[PDB]
Amino acid sequence: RKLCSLDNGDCDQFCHEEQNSVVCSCARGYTLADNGKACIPTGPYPCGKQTL
Amino acid sequence: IVGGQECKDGECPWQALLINEENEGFCGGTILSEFYILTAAHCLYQAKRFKVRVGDRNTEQEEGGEAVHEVEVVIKHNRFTKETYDFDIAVLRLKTPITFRMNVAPACLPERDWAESTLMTQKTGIVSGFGRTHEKGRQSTRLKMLEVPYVDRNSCKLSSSFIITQNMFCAGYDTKQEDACQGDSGGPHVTRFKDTYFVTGIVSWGEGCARKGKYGIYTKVTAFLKWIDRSMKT
Amino acid sequence: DEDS
Ligand SMILES: [Ca+2]
Ligand SMILES: [Cl-]
Ligand code: NA
């Protein structure tokens, strides 16, 4: 089983355990990907990313 | 900022600068969203009227990319006290929204429990600002950043002549001459985690700057995540 | 409150 203490539960951003299972989530302005792990920005200046 | 290095263009895009009546910087802030800036309550006492500048890389020349925004509302924590600097937090609601662009982008607010267990257990964070480059020295015309180690609470309390509350944390170095300083208050302490920068602190206070046996003291943002959220609903 |  995945754990938040190991590779952050495979979560890109937030990880927590509910009823003994990993649940990932993301900051505002990101959508959780279909895989339940990755965080996809909803626009061009998502929070927390340096600008290129 | 004492020590550290200049931010490259795009590297510290969440920095804001509070500017006084003479358009001089006196404190920092962190861009949270198009309308909201996080800062320190104590900065509110340091100018009678102020505005917010974003996108600045050189305070002594207009280069393009800067924008100034007037403040609509100041939301100050009602428990802020100069006796201890506890509750050193305020939020600014701008009159006009920030246009995100190169060098102008928000820092993320983290989820509160994960911040405490995962972000605060990272080795280091990044502090930035236009403040003094040495204790009792001059402010920087360039935006500087500095990597600061988290310092454990017990070590920090041992080091400190003043109370460290649960709303504060310590970061920096025992003797290495790197720290935040006057003029940096209110600015970001961010922690990088899997290539995303999260707001973890507010530059708040210290005994001197980069003094031997003293650390920088920061408002603990995790203690105020619900407060910050509510501040955007006045 | 205590967080006002
Ligand atoms: Ca400039
Ligand atoms: Cl703008
Ligand atoms: Na020190």
Short mmCIF file of C-alpha atoms and ligand atoms in Angstrom, two decimals:
data_model
loop_
_atom_site.label_atom_id
_atom_site.label_comp_id
_atom_site.label_asym_id
_atom_site.label_seq_id
_atom_site.Cartn_x
_atom_site.Cartn_y
_atom_site.Cartn_z
CA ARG A 1 0.00 0.00 0.00
CA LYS A 2 1.00 3.60 -0.59
CA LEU A 3 1.92 5.78 2.40
CA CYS A 4 2.44 9.55 2.66
CA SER A 5 5.82 8.84 4.32
CA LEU A 6 7.09 7.05 1.16
CA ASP A 7 7.46 9.26 -1.94
CA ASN A 8 4.73 11.46 -0.61
CA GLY A 9 2.20 8.70 -1.44
CA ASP A 10 3.16 9.33 -5.11
CA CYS A 11 1.17 12.61 -4.78
CA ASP A 12 2.46 15.64 -6.67
CA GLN A 13 1.37 18.01 -3.90
CA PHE A 14 -0.74 17.20 -0.83
CA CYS A 15 -0.97 13.72 0.66
CA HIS A 16 -3.11 12.51 3.55
CA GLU A 17 -4.35 9.07 4.70
CA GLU A 18 -8.09 8.45 5.15
CA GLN A 19 -9.45 5.16 6.54
CA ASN A 20 -5.92 3.83 6.04
CA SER A 21 -5.58 4.80 2.31
CA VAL A 22 -3.64 7.58 0.58
CA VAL A 23 -5.60 10.45 -0.87
CA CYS A 24 -3.80 13.09 -2.91
CA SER A 25 -4.95 16.67 -3.51
CA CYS A 26 -3.69 19.91 -5.02
CA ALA A 27 -3.46 23.65 -4.37
CA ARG A 28 -6.03 26.05 -5.71
CA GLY A 29 -5.59 26.48 -9.46
CA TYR A 30 -4.66 22.83 -10.02
CA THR A 31 -6.88 19.88 -10.90
CA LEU A 32 -6.15 16.35 -9.63
CA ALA A 33 -5.30 14.16 -12.62
CA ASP A 34 -7.21 11.02 -13.54
CA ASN A 35 -4.52 8.90 -11.87
CA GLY A 36 -5.43 10.53 -8.49
CA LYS A 37 -1.77 11.59 -8.05
CA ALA A 38 -0.71 14.40 -10.36
CA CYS A 39 -1.68 18.07 -10.18
CA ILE A 40 -2.50 19.79 -13.47
CA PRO A 41 -2.52 23.63 -13.63
CA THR A 42 -5.80 25.22 -14.78
CA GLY A 43 -4.12 28.36 -16.19
CA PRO A 44 -0.69 29.85 -17.21
CA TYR A 45 0.56 31.26 -13.91
CA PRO A 46 -0.30 28.50 -11.44
CA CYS A 47 0.77 29.10 -7.87
CA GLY A 48 4.19 28.11 -6.71
CA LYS A 49 5.82 27.91 -10.16
CA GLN A 50 8.65 30.19 -11.15
CA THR A 51 7.97 32.02 -14.39
CA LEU A 52 9.81 31.07 -17.60
CA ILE B 1 18.67 40.11 3.23
CA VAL B 2 22.20 39.56 4.58
CA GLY B 3 24.18 37.25 2.31
CA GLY B 4 22.23 35.24 -0.21
CA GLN B 5 22.07 36.29 -3.83
CA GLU B 6 19.98 38.29 -6.29
CA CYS B 7 16.81 36.67 -7.57
CA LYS B 8 16.96 36.06 -11.26
CA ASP B 9 14.04 37.30 -13.34
CA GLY B 10 11.15 34.87 -12.78
CA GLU B 11 12.74 33.17 -9.75
CA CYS B 12 10.96 35.03 -6.90
CA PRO B 13 7.76 36.09 -8.71
CA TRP B 14 5.58 36.05 -5.58
CA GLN B 15 7.53 38.89 -3.94
CA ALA B 16 5.65 42.12 -3.32
CA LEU B 17 7.10 45.40 -2.03
CA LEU B 18 5.23 47.74 0.27
CA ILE B 19 6.09 51.30 -0.69
CA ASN B 20 5.49 54.39 1.40
CA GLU B 21 4.34 57.93 0.52
CA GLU B 22 7.76 58.71 -1.00
CA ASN B 23 7.54 55.49 -3.05
CA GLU B 24 10.30 53.88 -0.94
CA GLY B 25 10.14 50.23 0.04
CA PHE B 26 9.85 49.45 3.74
CA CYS B 27 8.48 45.88 3.89
CA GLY B 28 7.72 42.87 1.73
CA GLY B 29 4.68 40.77 1.03
CA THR B 30 3.76 37.52 -0.69
CA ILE B 31 1.34 37.40 -3.61
CA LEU B 32 -1.40 34.90 -2.73
CA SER B 33 -3.84 35.59 -5.60
CA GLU B 34 -4.82 38.38 -7.95
CA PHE B 35 -6.36 40.46 -5.12
CA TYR B 36 -4.48 39.38 -1.97
CA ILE B 37 -1.06 39.97 -0.45
CA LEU B 38 0.21 38.33 2.76
CA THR B 39 2.36 40.55 4.99
CA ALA B 40 3.36 41.23 8.60
CA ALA B 41 1.07 43.18 10.95
CA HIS B 42 4.04 45.14 12.29
CA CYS B 43 4.66 46.65 8.85
CA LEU B 44 1.33 48.49 9.14
CA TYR B 45 2.86 50.77 11.80
CA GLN B 46 5.83 51.76 9.60
CA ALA B 47 4.10 53.96 7.05
CA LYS B 48 0.90 55.92 7.44
CA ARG B 49 -0.03 55.33 3.81
CA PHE B 50 1.40 52.72 1.49
CA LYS B 51 0.83 50.89 -1.77
CA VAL B 52 2.02 47.56 -3.20
CA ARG B 53 4.50 47.14 -6.01
CA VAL B 54 4.85 43.88 -7.87
CA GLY B 55 7.37 42.86 -10.56
CA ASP B 56 10.17 45.15 -9.35
CA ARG B 57 13.79 44.01 -9.92
CA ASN B 58 15.56 47.32 -9.29
CA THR B 59 14.05 49.92 -6.97
CA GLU B 60 16.04 52.84 -8.29
CA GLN B 61 14.82 52.64 -11.86
CA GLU B 62 11.61 51.99 -13.76
CA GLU B 63 12.58 49.03 -16.03
CA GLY B 64 9.21 47.78 -17.27
CA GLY B 65 7.31 44.98 -15.62
CA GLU B 66 6.60 46.92 -12.41
CA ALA B 67 3.03 47.65 -11.38
CA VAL B 68 1.67 49.49 -8.36
CA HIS B 69 -1.61 48.60 -6.73
CA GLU B 70 -3.53 50.54 -4.14
CA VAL B 71 -4.83 48.75 -1.07
CA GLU B 72 -8.60 48.55 -0.61
CA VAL B 73 -8.65 46.79 2.79
CA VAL B 74 -6.04 45.90 5.43
CA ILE B 75 -6.97 42.85 7.49
CA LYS B 76 -4.79 42.73 10.62
CA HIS B 77 -4.77 39.92 13.14
CA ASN B 78 -6.50 41.31 16.22
CA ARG B 79 -4.07 39.54 18.59
CA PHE B 80 -0.92 41.15 17.17
CA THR B 81 1.22 42.62 19.97
CA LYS B 82 4.49 44.55 19.85
CA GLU B 83 5.32 43.15 23.30
CA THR B 84 6.28 39.80 21.71
CA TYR B 85 5.52 40.11 17.95
CA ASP B 86 3.04 37.25 18.39
CA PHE B 87 0.39 37.06 15.68
CA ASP B 88 2.55 39.06 13.23
CA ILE B 89 0.26 38.68 10.24
CA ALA B 90 -1.93 40.79 8.00
CA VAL B 91 -3.58 40.42 4.60
CA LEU B 92 -4.03 43.19 2.04
CA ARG B 93 -6.92 43.24 -0.42
CA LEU B 94 -5.98 45.26 -3.50
CA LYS B 95 -8.28 47.68 -5.30
CA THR B 96 -7.30 46.35 -8.73
CA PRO B 97 -6.24 42.75 -9.52
CA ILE B 98 -2.67 41.81 -10.31
CA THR B 99 -1.97 40.71 -13.89
CA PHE B 100 0.16 37.57 -13.59
CA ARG B 101 3.06 37.65 -16.03
CA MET B 102 6.78 37.11 -16.15
CA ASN B 103 8.12 37.77 -12.66
CA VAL B 104 4.61 38.15 -11.13
CA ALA B 105 2.85 34.98 -9.89
CA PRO B 106 1.33 33.72 -6.60
CA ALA B 107 2.91 31.36 -4.08
CA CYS B 108 0.76 28.39 -3.06
CA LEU B 109 -0.93 28.07 0.29
CA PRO B 110 -0.41 24.50 1.48
CA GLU B 111 -2.88 22.21 3.15
CA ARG B 112 -2.41 22.66 6.87
CA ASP B 113 -1.67 19.15 8.20
CA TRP B 114 0.54 18.15 5.31
CA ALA B 115 2.41 21.50 5.68
CA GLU B 116 3.21 20.64 9.29
CA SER B 117 4.30 17.04 8.64
CA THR B 118 5.98 17.43 5.17
CA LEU B 119 6.91 21.10 4.45
CA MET B 120 8.12 22.04 7.91
CA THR B 121 10.28 18.87 7.93
CA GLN B 122 12.18 19.90 4.76
CA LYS B 123 15.77 20.95 5.45
CA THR B 124 15.42 24.54 4.13
CA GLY B 125 13.21 27.33 2.93
CA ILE B 126 13.84 30.45 0.85
CA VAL B 127 13.45 33.99 2.25
CA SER B 128 13.53 37.06 -0.03
CA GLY B 129 13.35 40.82 0.07
CA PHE B 130 14.67 44.28 -0.60
CA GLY B 131 15.65 44.91 3.03
CA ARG B 132 18.97 45.78 4.60
CA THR B 133 22.01 43.85 3.43
CA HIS B 134 23.75 44.09 6.81
CA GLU B 135 22.52 44.87 10.30
CA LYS B 136 22.16 48.68 10.52
CA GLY B 137 23.07 48.86 6.84
CA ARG B 138 21.28 49.94 3.67
CA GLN B 139 18.40 48.37 1.79
CA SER B 140 19.13 46.48 -1.39
CA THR B 141 18.05 48.03 -4.65
CA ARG B 142 17.90 44.47 -6.06
CA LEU B 143 15.63 41.68 -4.91
CA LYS B 144 17.62 39.11 -2.95
CA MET B 145 16.88 35.53 -1.93
CA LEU B 146 18.48 33.30 0.66
CA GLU B 147 18.22 29.63 1.56
CA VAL B 148 17.66 29.28 5.31
CA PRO B 149 17.71 26.00 7.27
CA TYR B 150 14.78 25.27 9.53
CA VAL B 151 15.95 25.43 13.15
CA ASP B 152 14.30 23.21 15.75
CA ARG B 153 12.13 24.86 18.37
CA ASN B 154 14.24 23.77 21.35
CA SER B 155 17.46 25.18 19.88
CA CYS B 156 15.67 28.33 18.96
CA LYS B 157 14.20 28.92 22.39
CA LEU B 158 17.70 28.33 23.91
CA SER B 159 19.13 30.93 21.54
CA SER B 160 16.47 33.57 22.10
CA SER B 161 16.23 36.34 24.72
CA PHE B 162 12.51 36.68 23.83
CA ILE B 163 9.60 34.26 23.81
CA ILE B 164 9.12 31.98 20.81
CA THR B 165 5.36 31.27 20.63
CA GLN B 166 3.61 28.45 18.79
CA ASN B 167 2.83 31.04 16.08
CA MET B 168 6.53 31.49 15.25
CA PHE B 169 9.42 29.42 13.95
CA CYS B 170 13.09 29.89 13.50
CA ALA B 171 15.26 29.65 10.48
CA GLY B 172 18.80 30.54 9.44
CA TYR B 173 22.28 30.03 10.82
CA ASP B 174 24.08 30.11 14.13
CA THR B 175 27.20 31.97 12.96
CA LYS B 176 27.10 32.04 9.14
CA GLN B 177 26.45 35.65 8.11
CA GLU B 178 23.16 35.08 6.29
CA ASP B 179 19.70 36.16 7.53
CA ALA B 180 16.75 38.42 6.83
CA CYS B 181 16.82 41.93 8.24
CA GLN B 182 14.92 45.18 8.67
CA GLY B 183 12.98 46.02 5.51
CA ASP B 184 12.38 42.32 4.75
CA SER B 185 9.40 41.97 7.16
CA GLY B 186 6.24 40.73 5.61
CA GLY B 187 8.04 39.05 2.74
CA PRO B 188 7.98 35.38 1.80
CA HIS B 189 9.51 32.39 3.42
CA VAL B 190 8.64 29.64 0.95
CA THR B 191 9.42 25.94 0.97
CA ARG B 192 9.96 24.04 -2.25
CA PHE B 193 8.47 20.58 -2.43
CA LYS B 194 8.42 18.52 -5.65
CA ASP B 195 9.07 21.63 -7.72
CA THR B 196 6.29 23.79 -6.23
CA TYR B 197 6.82 26.68 -3.82
CA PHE B 198 4.51 26.92 -0.81
CA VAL B 199 4.18 29.83 1.62
CA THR B 200 5.49 28.69 5.01
CA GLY B 201 6.56 31.89 6.77
CA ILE B 202 6.39 35.64 7.05
CA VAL B 203 9.60 37.54 7.91
CA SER B 204 8.80 38.85 11.41
CA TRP B 205 11.64 39.70 13.83
CA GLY B 206 15.09 38.91 15.15
CA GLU B 207 17.82 40.01 17.52
CA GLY B 208 20.00 41.94 15.11
CA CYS B 209 20.58 40.50 11.64
CA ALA B 210 22.84 37.47 11.09
CA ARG B 211 24.05 37.83 14.70
CA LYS B 212 26.14 34.99 16.10
CA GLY B 213 23.98 32.68 18.22
CA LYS B 214 20.70 34.16 16.95
CA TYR B 215 18.27 33.08 14.23
CA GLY B 216 15.62 34.75 12.09
CA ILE B 217 12.11 34.54 13.50
CA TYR B 218 9.14 33.99 11.19
CA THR B 219 5.38 33.96 11.56
CA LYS B 220 4.29 30.35 11.18
CA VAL B 221 1.86 30.42 8.27
CA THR B 222 0.48 26.96 9.02
CA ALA B 223 -0.97 28.35 12.25
CA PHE B 224 -2.96 30.91 10.26
CA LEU B 225 -4.19 29.04 7.18
CA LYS B 226 -7.83 29.17 8.28
CA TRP B 227 -7.40 32.86 9.27
CA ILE B 228 -5.93 33.68 5.83
CA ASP B 229 -8.79 31.92 4.10
CA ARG B 230 -11.34 33.85 6.18
CA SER B 231 -9.52 37.17 5.50
CA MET B 232 -10.69 36.94 1.91
CA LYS B 233 -14.36 36.95 3.02
CA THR B 234 -14.66 40.25 4.95
CA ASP C 1 -13.22 34.97 18.43
CA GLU C 2 -9.64 33.90 19.26
CA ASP C 3 -8.70 34.25 15.61
CA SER C 4 -10.37 37.49 14.65
CA CA D 1 12.39 49.02 -11.00
CL CL D 2 -0.18 43.93 -12.02
NA NA D 3 23.08 33.68 13.53
#
